[PDB]
Design a protein around this nucleic acid. Structure first.
Ligand code: MG
Ligand code: MG
Ligand code: MG
Ligand code: MG
Ligand code: MG
Ligand code: MG
Ligand code: MG
Ligand code: MG
Ligand code: MG
Ligand code: MG
Ligand code: MG
Ligand code: MG
Ligand code: MG
Ligand code: MG
Ligand code: MG
Ligand code: MG
Ligand code: MG
Ligand code: MG
Ligand code: MG
Ligand code: MG
Ligand code: MG
Ligand code: MG
Ligand code: MG
Ligand code: MG
Ligand code: MG
Ligand code: MG
Ligand code: MG
Ligand code: MG
Ligand code: MG
Ligand code: MG
Ligand code: MG
Ligand code: MG
Ligand code: MG
Ligand code: MG
Ligand code: MG
Ligand code: MG
Ligand code: MG
Ligand code: MG
Ligand code: MG
Ligand code: MG
Ligand code: MG
Ligand code: MG
Ligand code: MG
Ligand code: MG
Ligand code: MG
Ligand code: MG
Ligand code: MG
Ligand code: MG
Ligand code: MG
Ligand code: MG
Ligand code: MG
Ligand code: MG
Ligand code: MG
Ligand code: MG
Ligand code: MG
Ligand code: MG
Ligand code: MG
Ligand code: MG
Ligand code: MG
Ligand code: MG
Ligand code: MG
Ligand code: MG
Ligand code: MG
Ligand code: MG
Ligand code: MG
Ligand code: MG
Ligand code: MG
Ligand code: MG
Ligand code: MG
Ligand code: MG
Ligand code: MG
Ligand code: MG
Ligand code: MG
Ligand code: MG
Ligand code: MG
Ligand code: MG
Ligand code: MG
Ligand code: MG
Ligand code: MG
Ligand code: MG
Ligand code: MG
Ligand code: MG
Ligand code: MG
Ligand code: MG
Ligand code: MG
Ligand code: MG
Ligand code: MG
Ligand code: MG
Ligand code: MG
Ligand code: MG
Ligand code: MG
Ligand code: MG
Ligand code: MG
Ligand code: MG
Ligand code: MG
Ligand code: MG
Ligand code: MG
Ligand code: MG
Ligand code: MG
Ligand code: MG
Ligand code: MG
Ligand code: MG
Ligand code: MG
Ligand code: MG
Ligand code: MG
Ligand code: MG
Ligand code: MG
Ligand code: MG
Ligand code: MG
Ligand code: MG
Ligand code: MG
Ligand code: MG
Ligand code: MG
Ligand code: MG
Ligand code: MG
Ligand code: MG
Ligand code: MG
Ligand code: MG
Ligand code: MG
Ligand code: MG
Ligand code: MG
Ligand code: MG
Ligand code: MG
Ligand code: MG
Ligand code: MG
Ligand code: MG
Ligand code: MG
Ligand code: MG
Ligand code: MG
Ligand code: MG
Ligand code: MG
Ligand code: MG
Ligand code: MG
Ligand code: MG
Ligand code: MG
Ligand code: MG
Ligand code: MG
Ligand code: MG
Ligand code: MG
Ligand code: MG
Ligand code: MG
Ligand code: MG
Ligand code: MG
Ligand code: MG
Ligand code: MG
Ligand code: MG
Ligand code: MG
Ligand code: MG
Ligand code: MG
Ligand code: MG
Ligand code: MG
Ligand code: MG
Ligand code: MG
Ligand code: MG
Ligand code: MG
Ligand code: MG
Ligand code: MG
Ligand code: MG
Ligand code: MG
Ligand code: MG
Ligand code: MG
Ligand code: MG
Ligand code: MG
Ligand code: MG
Ligand code: MG
Ligand code: MG
Ligand code: MG
Ligand code: MG
Ligand code: MG
Ligand code: MG
Ligand code: MG
Ligand code: MG
Ligand code: MG
Ligand code: MG
Ligand code: MG
Ligand code: MG
Ligand code: MG
Ligand code: MG
Ligand code: MG
Ligand code: MG
Ligand code: MG
Ligand code: MG
Ligand code: MG
Ligand code: MG
Ligand code: MG
Ligand code: MG
Ligand code: MG
Ligand code: MG
Ligand code: MG
Ligand code: MG
Ligand code: MG
Ligand code: MG
Ligand code: MG
Ligand code: MG
Ligand code: MG
Ligand code: MG
Ligand code: MG
Ligand code: ZN
Lengths: 95, 107, 97, 70
RNA sequence: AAUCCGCCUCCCAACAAGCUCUGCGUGGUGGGGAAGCCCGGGUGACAACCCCCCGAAGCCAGGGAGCCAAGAAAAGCCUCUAAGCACAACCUGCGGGAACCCGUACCGCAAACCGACACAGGUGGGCGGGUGCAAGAGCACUCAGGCGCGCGGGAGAA
RNA sequence: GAAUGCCGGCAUGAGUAACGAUAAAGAGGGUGAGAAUCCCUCUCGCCGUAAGCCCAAGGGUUCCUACGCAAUGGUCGUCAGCGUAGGGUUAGGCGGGACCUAAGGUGAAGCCGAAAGGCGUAGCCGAAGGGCAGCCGGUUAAUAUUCCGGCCCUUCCCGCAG
RNA sequence: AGCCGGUAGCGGGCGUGGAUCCCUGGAUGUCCGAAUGGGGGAACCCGGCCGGCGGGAACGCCGGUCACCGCGCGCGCGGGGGGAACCUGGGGAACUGAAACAUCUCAGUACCCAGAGGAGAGGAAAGAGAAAUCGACUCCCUGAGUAGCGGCGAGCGAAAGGGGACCAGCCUAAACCGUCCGGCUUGUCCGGGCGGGGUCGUGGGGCCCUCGGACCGAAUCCCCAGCCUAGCCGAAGCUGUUGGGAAGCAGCGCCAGAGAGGGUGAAAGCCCCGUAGGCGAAAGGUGGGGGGAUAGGUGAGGGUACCCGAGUACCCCGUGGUUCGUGGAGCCAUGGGGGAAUCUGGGCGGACCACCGCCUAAGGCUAAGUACUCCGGGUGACCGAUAGCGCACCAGUAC
């Protein structure tokens, strides 16, 4: 069954994602098929917050090889939610 | 469906062939995919180890080398001789290995 | 050119054989074939329009089976046909075959 | 998970109602997300926990389905 | 069907006005801001931010004239009415909420595209500064910007 | 032992022709085991209706950073569009879709053809044509009309008023 | 009794309270694909209706449902697409051979198409063809390279009969009886549905008199044996010696319904895996064998002359099939024209006629014996990495 916890996979760990915490922008890896509206809801029920804006982008898997074998990493989507003024997502503040 | 093993961790085996023919020991491990056993203190080899956290000072370690399972024979815990195994059905009737020289269980 | 809705008569393939020469039966040396090539022989299809149950039904039918359409109309009197579509009437009629 | 704890999970689950199964799955799905997050910042040494939870959720959903199936 | 559109008649207006739409200017406000000098950044700086000239192929635009070869459709939009409905509905103004999916890196006259090659070939659209040469997208030099072309060093025969 | 046989390997020509536009170089400093070839400075030259800049195709991570130099690079290589890894693409207003139709395609009705199939007013699909609401600046190593800041705007839902 | 795939490592776990693993059944099963809500450049996009989630009306997500055609009274059932060969049907070449080439051959082959299925086709005489005969069909041997066909060239090539394999026969239409329903030209009507009846070549049936009054039995159904999809038991060797290693050599033994074969440090009946001989299924599949049920089956004279498959037979024209190429050309089939009869009917025995016989057309079904090999197993005077499949290896891949 589908729950908010199937939509948010992991937080994004990078200097760029951390730089967003200051102004209330949290960046998650999400399920590649998930809609802004749905992520809005998922984040709100998982982190008890009020999402005001959602930016999403697709992230193509990089091509990679181990010896003879050419392959690809999985495709990913990342989402950047803005919480209401003053709110905070403590699991992420983290760091 | 499964590799057949007449011997198991860790009954007591006679090593019946190879450089260590005649030794007796416990089976430390059974490796069915290779069809092999490790017998305690049998088939010792010298292995090089790099100077590493796992092994500062480096140099060499001794490792026990696997033996082809067919080189090994269980010693009956009743009569004390190396034996072939027979199976016997109990009253349960679970089945068990038994010495083939006398009748005793081998576990 | 096609299929008789009644008999199932369909175009068939025939040879057209060209011959030259005097038949043996007439004292000639015999017939020689100067050509064989495929051709089709079609059914003599024609249109037959009929009113049945206040509707106009038409059949594409070999001339040989033109009377078979009218016979179908006769057999149709015993049927609740009024108010059906002409596609539906034609089906009931054909089903009588 | 230990085999005996699996039996135990199935017995306890089988006593539950669909609705109670839904609440419990949802909680476990939540508990998995927490685990995922911990794995990603390198703080989950006990990583067998992830395989486990995922199968509890399966087992539960499997049973939920049993319940609704007739 | 129609109060709309077409057609006939009458009255008033008619290179106007009015109404309407767009361009440009101004406009609360918000920004930028050189050389040079110090180590992309600082300063210059409270930077100044003004006048004159040239001036489009762009804009006002659905502008104008002339010509013959006589120059898409459909929706948006306005208007008309029909079933209906007229406590509805629609229009206008204001307020609050709501606003999905895909693309977006980088090359792009080329070493990243088409040519088996980091190939003197081929690749549609826009911008493309200054001076001088009658003009110009020509030519020479040159700005911004970008390059010296991924073997070199000598030698000074045929 | 021969088939200008077939597959493979290795010779010869030969240290030979060539190293891909005759726009062009020089020096100092740095780095490194190693430097004509990488970095920095100054000097010199070349393009400048381009050999600069922006879009669309096509390409598909080639982008940015760190660590590397076996091979790839016509030489060299410490460098690189190369190897390894990590990061990086953010939109109600840009583009396309949830709008329109063009050729054409498809195709209720219908017509035709041994089978397969071929046609076909409507409708539907089909765009680089029509329609539709965002400008200036700042910020990152790397995105920005997308994030931020300022000033503007569109549709949809609900409500209130006329 | 180990295990968390190839797959080691890091980092963590599981298992005699029976894990991993194997077999059976079930659950889950994103998107695309016949692909089927609609669209589309497959794997993307966009909707309607019902229900749910969120603060939820806009927005989004979750569950259900929505294509078209056929058949039967909006609803039911079915179809669609795939499959290596095999199979039937609808179409259907050419090189080549003829030492040229056209008829002819290649060949009804290659190939396209439709359809079926584990087979398909065919099948219960309007047969054969000379026997006073046989007795559905299929398939093998033979008949026979015969008979014949043939620019009587090149070539092509039957059938009966005989020996075998398998074995099996059924259901209808019509007469006539009854019933429901419809029609207008009102019944002794016509027509449609359903049921009853009937099914054959010594002709059979119908109807009207007379006489007579339990056995067989499925190809459908049910149960079961057997079989498949995992498995399991399974005899007998020690010592010495050379050697890295014994299974070699030596000494003394033992098993054998097992001395097939493969492993183990070299060459092993007795070490391992096996082998001979045995054993084994809760579940699913099969079940042509065994048992049971059900459907269905079954008389004799005599009379009547009602029925016995129609655009059919039959004749002619054009063609195809057959060994038959226009021939003395019948037979089977049928595109065109014409066009019957109901046994005193009709078709056939190679033009035709007579005689003498054979057989019952114009409705349908039918196991088995036959074909093939994607799949599993067994076995090779089969290959052994230029071989053998294109591929022993991550190949229908790189390119
Ligand atoms: Mg699910
Ligand atoms: Mg940063
Ligand atoms: Mg949601
Ligand atoms: Mg986006
Ligand atoms: Mg992967
Ligand atoms: Mg066993
Ligand atoms: Mg010894
Ligand atoms: Mg047991
Ligand atoms: Mg002719
Ligand atoms: Mg003649
Ligand atoms: Mg004569
Ligand atoms: Mg002739
Ligand atoms: Mg007519
Ligand atoms: Mg005719
Ligand atoms: Mg006629
Ligand atoms: Mg009118
Ligand atoms: Mg203005
Ligand atoms: Mg203004
Ligand atoms: Mg400044
Ligand atoms: Mg400066
Ligand atoms: Mg200042
Ligand atoms: Mg100052
Ligand atoms: Mg004009
Ligand atoms: Mg038009
Ligand atoms: Mg329209
Ligand atoms: Mg009204
Ligand atoms: Mg109004
Ligand atoms: Mg508003
Ligand atoms: Mg949508
Ligand atoms: Mg997107
Ligand atoms: Mg692109
Ligand atoms: Mg971008
Ligand atoms: Mg860009
Ligand atoms: Mg470049
Ligand atoms: Mg560029
Ligand atoms: Mg050029
Ligand atoms: Mg250009
Ligand atoms: Mg360029
Ligand atoms: Mg190129
Ligand atoms: Mg290239
Ligand atoms: Mg170059
Ligand atoms: Mg070039
Ligand atoms: Mg050009
Ligand atoms: Mg000038
Ligand atoms: Mg000049
Ligand atoms: Mg000039
Ligand atoms: Mg100029
Ligand atoms: Mg020039
Ligand atoms: Mg310069
Ligand atoms: Mg140069
Ligand atoms: Mg010289
Ligand atoms: Mg020779
Ligand atoms: Mg040669
Ligand atoms: Mg040669
Ligand atoms: Mg050769
Ligand atoms: Mg050779
Ligand atoms: Mg060769
Ligand atoms: Mg060669
Ligand atoms: Mg050489
Ligand atoms: Mg030399
Ligand atoms: Mg030379
Ligand atoms: Mg020379
Ligand atoms: Mg030379
Ligand atoms: Mg060259
Ligand atoms: Mg030279
Ligand atoms: Mg060069
Ligand atoms: Mg050069
Ligand atoms: Mg020159
Ligand atoms: Mg230098
Ligand atoms: Mg130097
Ligand atoms: Mg260098
Ligand atoms: Mg160097
Ligand atoms: Mg150079
Ligand atoms: Mg440099
Ligand atoms: Mg020049
Ligand atoms: Mg210039
Ligand atoms: Mg490419
Ligand atoms: Mg790469
Ligand atoms: Mg970039
Ligand atoms: Mg890179
Ligand atoms: Mg780079
Ligand atoms: Mg570096
Ligand atoms: Mg290199
Ligand atoms: Mg090098
Ligand atoms: Mg080197
Ligand atoms: Mg390396
Ligand atoms: Mg190279
Ligand atoms: Mg090099
Ligand atoms: Mg090169
Ligand atoms: Mg270095
Ligand atoms: Mg490079
Ligand atoms: Mg790189
Ligand atoms: Mg915006
Ligand atoms: Mg929408
Ligand atoms: Mg559209
Ligand atoms: Mg349209
Ligand atoms: Mg079409
Ligand atoms: Mg059309
Ligand atoms: Mg539309
Ligand atoms: Mg458009
Ligand atoms: Mg446009
Ligand atoms: Mg739009
Ligand atoms: Mg737009
Ligand atoms: Mg604006
Ligand atoms: Mg950039
Ligand atoms: Mg960026
Ligand atoms: Mg903004
Ligand atoms: Mg009101
Ligand atoms: Mg693994
Ligand atoms: Mg460890
Ligand atoms: Mg471990
Ligand atoms: Mg058990
Ligand atoms: Mg299963
Ligand atoms: Mg999903
Ligand atoms: Mg699907
Ligand atoms: Mg669809
Ligand atoms: Mg479709
Ligand atoms: Mg739906
Ligand atoms: Mg709803
Ligand atoms: Mg909320
Ligand atoms: Mg809602
Ligand atoms: Mg849904
Ligand atoms: Mg089909
Ligand atoms: Mg099929
Ligand atoms: Mg055929
Ligand atoms: Mg057909
Ligand atoms: Mg044919
Ligand atoms: Mg042809
Ligand atoms: Mg020919
Ligand atoms: Mg040939
Ligand atoms: Mg010949
Ligand atoms: Mg010839
Ligand atoms: Mg010849
Ligand atoms: Mg010739
Ligand atoms: Mg020929
Ligand atoms: Mg031939
Ligand atoms: Mg032939
Ligand atoms: Mg055929
Ligand atoms: Mg074939
Ligand atoms: Mg099929
Ligand atoms: Mg069979
Ligand atoms: Mg059959
Ligand atoms: Mg059949
Ligand atoms: Mg019969
Ligand atoms: Mg003979
Ligand atoms: Mg023939
Ligand atoms: Mg004959
Ligand atoms: Mg025979
Ligand atoms: Mg026979
Ligand atoms: Mg047999
Ligand atoms: Mg009747
Ligand atoms: Mg009646
Ligand atoms: Mg009746
Ligand atoms: Mg009779
Ligand atoms: Mg039967
Ligand atoms: Mg055994
Ligand atoms: Mg044994
Ligand atoms: Mg020794
Ligand atoms: Mg020994
Ligand atoms: Mg001996
Ligand atoms: Mg034997
Ligand atoms: Mg043997
Ligand atoms: Mg052997
Ligand atoms: Mg021997
Ligand atoms: Mg031997
Ligand atoms: Mg052996
Ligand atoms: Mg046996
Ligand atoms: Mg056995
Ligand atoms: Mg009688
Ligand atoms: Mg009669
Ligand atoms: Mg008959
Ligand atoms: Mg009939
Ligand atoms: Mg004829
Ligand atoms: Mg013929
Ligand atoms: Mg003749
Ligand atoms: Mg004939
Ligand atoms: Mg005919
Ligand atoms: Mg007769
Ligand atoms: Mg007669
Ligand atoms: Mg006949
Ligand atoms: Mg005849
Ligand atoms: Mg006759
Ligand atoms: Mg006859
Ligand atoms: Mg006969
Ligand atoms: Mg049949
Ligand atoms: Mg049978
Ligand atoms: Mg058969
Ligand atoms: Mg077979
Ligand atoms: Mg096989
Ligand atoms: Mg061999
Ligand atoms: Mg090889
Ligand atoms: Mg090979
Ligand atoms: Mg070899
Ligand atoms: Mg293979
Ligand atoms: Mg090969
Ligand atoms: Mg190979
Ligand atoms: Mg490969
Ligand atoms: Zn014992």
């Amino acid at each position: 069954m589908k729950t908010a916890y199937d939509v948010i996979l992991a937080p994004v760990l990078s200097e760029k994602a951390y730089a967003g915490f200051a102004e209330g922008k949290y960046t998650f890896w999400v399920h590649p098929k998930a809609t802004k509206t749905e992520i809005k809801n998922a984040v709100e029920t998982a982190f008890k917050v009020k999402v005001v804006k959602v930016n999403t982008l697709h992230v193509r898997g990089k091509k990679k090889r181990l010896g003879r074998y050419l392959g690809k990493r999985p495709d990913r989507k990342k989402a950047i939610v803005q919480v209401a003024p003053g709110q905070k997502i403590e699991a992420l503040e983290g760091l | 469906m499964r590799v057949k093993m007449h011997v198991k961790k860790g009954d007591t085996v006679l090593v019946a062939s190879g450089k260590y023919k005649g030794r007796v020991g416990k089976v430390k491990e059974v490796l069915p995919k290779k069809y092999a056993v490790i017998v305690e203190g049998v088939n010792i080899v010298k292995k090089a180890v790099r100077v590493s956290p796992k092994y500062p000072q480096g140099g060499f370690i001794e490792k026990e080398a696997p033996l082809h399972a067919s080189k090994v024979r269980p010693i009956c815990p009743a009569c004390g001789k190396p034996t072939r195994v027979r199976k016997k059905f109990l009253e349960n009737g679970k089945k068990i290995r038994v010495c083939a020289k006398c009748g005793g269980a081998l576990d | 050119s096609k299929v008789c809705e009644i008999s199932g008569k369909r175009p068939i393939v025939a040879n057209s054989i060209q011959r030259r020469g005097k038949a043996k039966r007439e004292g000639g040396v015999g017939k020689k074939t100067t050509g064989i090539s495929k051709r089709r022989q079609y059914p003599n299809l024609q249109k037959v329009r009929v009113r049945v149950a206040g509707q106009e039904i038409t059949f594409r039918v070999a001339a040989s089976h033109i009377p078979k359409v009218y016979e179908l109309v006769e057999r149709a009197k015993g049927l609740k046909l009024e108010g059906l579509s002409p596609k539906e009437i034609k089906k009931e009629l054909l089903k009588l075959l | 998970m230990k085999l005996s704890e699996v039996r135990k999970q199935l017995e306890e689950a089988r006593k539950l109602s669909p609705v109670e199964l839904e609440k419990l799955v949802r909680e476990k799905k939540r508990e998995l997300m927490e685990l995922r997050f911990q794995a990603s910042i390198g703080q989950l040494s006990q990583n067998h926990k992830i395989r486990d939870l995922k199968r509890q959720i399966a087992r539960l959903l499997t049973v939920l389905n049993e319940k609704r199936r007739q």
